[PDB]
């Protein structure tokens, strides 16, 4: 609808945490459209122009002593401080996965099918999902969507297995996740239903 | 590699005169400031019990960003942003069973500028009832992502779509979903 040209300023103040808070890196990043033009990186300790467009800003701001000391304190005053405030419901947050198993194509036996394992609602992102046929793990024929972020502090993943079920067979999906102290296991037995 | 990242992300966009202030923990939103209401808005209501944020401080930042934008626009010889059209994916919150409450999720990815018209369609007709959306979320490549949500009761009779407009697309983009039987 609107074909008027557009103009965008972004600013990202980023705190990167390694080994709890025992190493923190603070980045103050300025963007024009998508182009980073100037940044302060606590590891460098002054502003550096990323693109020629940022030189006037790097040079002006680096001439301001109070400004630099202030950016140099940001690892503590800003990053550690905010890590403190949010830690309890972010870093510590754990929601259990829900596991559901089903065939994708309602087919007869001795015919190719995808058994779907749907893992849903979990936090944080890290998870592992294993398929077994009888008691034997199968890493062959595993087709996965990967980690999908739902945008609401939960993730899902869908892990499918390529089978040809014959009816004397049992298949199992095993899930591990930090919220759990033991795997959640879900079975599917090969028959008409 | 790093355990966690907290990003305070701001923008201002002309000539729309529109801006965002938000916090982000590992790619999920803690909160944002509704520039209209001048209020902090927690992504989950529970976060607000544990923390607080002086929203007036966000609006000041935005004013600095607006004023800077004017400067940057000149400095670039009035070079505008190149549209990057979005990718859209629709998926369910949990697996689909008939008559069992569920939520359709519209994941809108890898676009800029942060202006989109989104509409859930049920059988080609819009639906506002019970729906929700995030603000525009930052990406490491400096594009944006966004989610919309529609509660629904699955059915053999219904079809659904996520209709996304954006200046980088020639036409509206529909992403389709229907009960799978």
């Amino acid at each position: 609808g609107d074909t008027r040209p557009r103009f965008l300023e972004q600013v990202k103040h980023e705190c990167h945490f390694f080994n709890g808070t025992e190493r923190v890196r603070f980045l103050d990043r300025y963007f024009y459209h998508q182009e980073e033009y100037v940044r302060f990186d606590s590891d460098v300790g002054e502003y550096r122009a990323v693109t020629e467009l940022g030189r006037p800003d790097a040079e002006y701001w680096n001439s301001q002593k109070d400004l630099l000391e202030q950016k140099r304190a940001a690892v503590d005053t800003y990053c550690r401080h905010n890590y403190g405030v949010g830690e309890s419901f972010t870093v510590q947050r754990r929601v259990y996965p829900e596991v559901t198993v089903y065939p994708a194509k309602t087919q007869p036996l001795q015919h190719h099918n995808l058994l779907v394992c749907s893992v849903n609602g979990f936090y944080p992102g890290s998870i592992e999902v294993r398929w077994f046929r009888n008691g034997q793990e199968e890493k062959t024929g595993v087709v996965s969507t990967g980690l999908i972020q739902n945008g609401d502090w939960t993730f899902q993943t869908l892990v499918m297995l390529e089978t040809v079920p014959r009816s004397g067979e049992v298949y199992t999906c095993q899930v591990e996740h930090p919220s759990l102290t033991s795997p959640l296991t879900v079975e599917w037995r090969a028959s008409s239903a | 590699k790093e355990e966690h990242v907290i990003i305070q992300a701001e923008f201002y966009l002309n000539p729309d005169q529109s801006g965002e202030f938000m916090f982000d923990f590992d790619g999920d939103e803690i909160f944002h400031v509704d520039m209209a209401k001048k209020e902090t808005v927690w992504r989950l209501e529970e976060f607000g019990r544990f923390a607080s944020f002086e929203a007036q401080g966000a609006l000041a930042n935005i004013a600095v960003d607006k004023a800077n934008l004017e400067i940057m626009t000149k400095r670039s010889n009035y070079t505008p942003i190149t549209n990057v059209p979005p990718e859209v994916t629709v998926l369910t919150n949990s697996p689909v069973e008939l008559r069992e409450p569920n939520v359709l999720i519209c994941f809108i990815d890898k676009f800029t500028p942060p202006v989109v018209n989104v509409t859930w369609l049920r059988n080609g007709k819009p639906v506002t009832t019970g729906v929700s959306e995030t603000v525009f979320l930052p990406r490491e490549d400096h594009l944006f992502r966004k989610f919309h949500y529609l509660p629904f009761l699955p059915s053999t009779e219904d079809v659904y779509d996520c209709r996304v407009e954006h200046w980088g697309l020639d036409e509206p983009l529909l992403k389709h979903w229907e009960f799978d039987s």
Partner: peptide, 14 residues
């Protein structure tokens, strides 16, 4: 028990 998030501030350009 109830903590306050601090905003980092952008600098005015030249």
């Amino acid at each position: 028990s109830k903590g306050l998030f601090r905003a980092a501030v952008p600098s005015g350009a030249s």
